[PDB]
Amino acid sequence: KTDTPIQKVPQSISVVTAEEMALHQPKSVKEALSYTPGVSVGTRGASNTYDHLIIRGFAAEGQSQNNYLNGLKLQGNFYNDAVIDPYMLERAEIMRGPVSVLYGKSSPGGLLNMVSKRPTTEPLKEVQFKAGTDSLFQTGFDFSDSLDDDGVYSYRLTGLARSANAQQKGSEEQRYAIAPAFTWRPDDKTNFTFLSYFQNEPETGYYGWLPKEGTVEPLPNGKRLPTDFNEGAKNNTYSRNEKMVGYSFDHEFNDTFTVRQNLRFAENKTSQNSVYGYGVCSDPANAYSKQCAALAPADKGHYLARKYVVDDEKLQNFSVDTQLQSKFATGDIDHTLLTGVDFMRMRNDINAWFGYDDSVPLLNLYNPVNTDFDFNAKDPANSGPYRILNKQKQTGVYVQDQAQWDKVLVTLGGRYDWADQESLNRVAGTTDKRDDKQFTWRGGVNYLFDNGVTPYFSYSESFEPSSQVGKDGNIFAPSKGKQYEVGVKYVPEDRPIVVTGAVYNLTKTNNLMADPEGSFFSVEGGEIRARGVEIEAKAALSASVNVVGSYTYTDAEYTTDTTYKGNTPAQVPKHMASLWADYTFFDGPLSGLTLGTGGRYTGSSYGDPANSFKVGSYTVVDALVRYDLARVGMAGSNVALHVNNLFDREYVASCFNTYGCFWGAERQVVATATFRF
């Protein structure tokens, strides 16, 4: 009979919601969390192929994807991963420093827990049109409602159709997604939400490399390469198909027990026939290149030697998580005990054909002649197959409790994993089998003040497995993390502000920096120790103005790699920050206008593992405008215009070595016209 307790356990300190999603309408999940702290998402630059990001130095899980999607670990292995458009996401939260052990299989530092769009018991009939530069025309449709008077049965159908011409001249982007959803809710202690996802991407877009030359250092001529240069061939294709089905279930028996179970069967697959550039002839690489050798010592600086790759993969994934929530209380110390198991079955069949040095002709740079290419040619001197089959089986039991005493909350959990892994090289008949058994535990302590101030300190571990595989089928060793995190969060009961800060010391072992000098087949390396400070400010200064700001300091080096020991990994900026704000001109002549603008900064980053050249610091400014047609009679329907990179600044995002950099994104304009019924 109390006034009902509000929430005080620190949660949702970095979630973007549907109200924030429909306001920004991010072209990809690379955006959206573009202004959230602890992440740098402009690492790849301008490429809607993969949605990777660097939380606290370390990136995606086994470089694949350290992201979650309605529980579970998303999926992905050896370049066959899953991407999801934000138009199919209701909530996409980024959890920096998770204290739970359900995320113990993930990185101790960060995690992207995406949430699909759940059926609503209220009628929702949304139709979205957004179009702009670069032949972009995405059409959305979202229709959800109930099916009975009680609402026990509810539905939701969201779908997408986007076609666009990529920045690099010659590459196209096309994505067609459709996600049916259903929810059965008889009483208040039972829910069986079914979630499915189907997406066909005939053209993923662009995925190539450009040398450190025309990108960051003036070419021999004295000029720099154009912003839209496609070093591949005209017939470069890149397709992907994702099929997912699953559910999320939970039932509360007594006020002390609650069971939950999550599941998903996914079937992702991709195909690639692309040519990638491997730096100019003057690069320390090539060297042994025959086409590069037959050149004068003056012409080797403006002739790009490349390679090609043909690949065809097929993934079958299966994930299960079943937990029991025991909410008892001992003495005067309340408890919320979680006891669950997980399961994982992976199976990826690689039937690829790679191209070694001098596999393609050479580009002139001054006079590029990007033609077509015979990807079906299998010359034994410059090319070689790679038929591998990878299978994984993981099984881990986890137990976690959230003990509460007066104003003290201690989060403690422990998990033990049985990870199995098997690869088969169809060429040499080699069959590798690796079974690992490791314990990992997470623990966090914090104090709850009455106003919302909460100082916390946590010790994090992880048993992050290896997603990728090496040449000849090298099963990489799983990665083990160790993180000391201390900080203080302000979650005010009264005023509408949020400010949080933290400093960490994360150390992950068996890391892979990729690029075994030659080939992108990745390579084993030493452990990395990452230190840095993250701060966040999220508030609503008055009803018209909403503000969000964040700053991220990051300092990480190799710990035991001898070769690059004591060097900062590439693509990692030291300083990093961003800021955004939006005004709402309600109750006035322009009651409906919503003007918003923001900027992003990324500090200086290194370009190669040896730290030879450095990438300059860039600053991108976005802006957007939105007017709700409340003055025309269309409640909930709005027409919005979005500008990214306002002043159009040419910058290099990041580089992985001397023979590969990434141009930034030029000015993009998007005119959204979303209608609700």
Binding site: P5, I6, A18, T120, P492, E493, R495, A539, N546, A635
Partner: protein
């Protein structure tokens, strides 16, 4: 720091999570979106009037 505060709280709302009913402090309203400020609820200040179960006390805004 914000222009609002503990004195500018108009009404309170109700929502459920982990199968227990909670409370959220509400402020101004825009069309069909409340400006709840526990943060640890919807994840954003501007939450739509649907995430809650019984707005009750928010029957008088305009």
């Amino acid at each position: 720091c914000s222009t609002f505060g503990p004195k500018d709280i108009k009404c309170e709302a109700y929502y459920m999570q982990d199968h227990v009913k909670y409370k959220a402090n509400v402020f101004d309203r825009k069309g069909d979106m409340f400006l709840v400020s526990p943060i640890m609820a919807y994840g954003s200040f501007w939450a739509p009037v649907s995430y809650f179960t019984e707005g009750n006390t928010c029957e008088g805004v305009f």
